[PDB]
Design a protein around this ligand. Sequence first.
Ligand SMILES: CCC(=O)c1c[nH]c(C(=O)NC)c1
Length: 113
Amino acid sequence: MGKLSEQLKHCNGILKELLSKKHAAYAWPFYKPVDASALGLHDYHDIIKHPMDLSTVKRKMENRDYRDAQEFAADVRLMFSNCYKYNPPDHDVVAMARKLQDVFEFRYAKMPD
Ligand SMILES: CCC(=O)c1c[nH]c(C(=O)NC)c1
């Protein structure tokens, strides 16, 4: 297969891992779009202009929306950045984001050339 295909297989592997039971204890806040209204976060969409979550990343991967690994990584990192922008840095969800980003960055680094 081509490099872009092989790199997107690596990306799909990472996505499956981020959604796996292994990481569920800290990944679960990132599974679905933030329901701002339901959670009482009435300022969320004033602060976060581009919401992102792992179900949206999964839909985009399934729809062949991602043309390369860089585009995939941009959405996963946008998801983490939204968490660091919105939440005070001492909040539990930020610790969970940092742990899941550690999983992401270390495996993303193993991208086949
Ligand atoms: C009620 C508080 C709450 O559930 C929450 C706060 N921040 C987030 C978040 O950034 N989720 C990605 C969720």
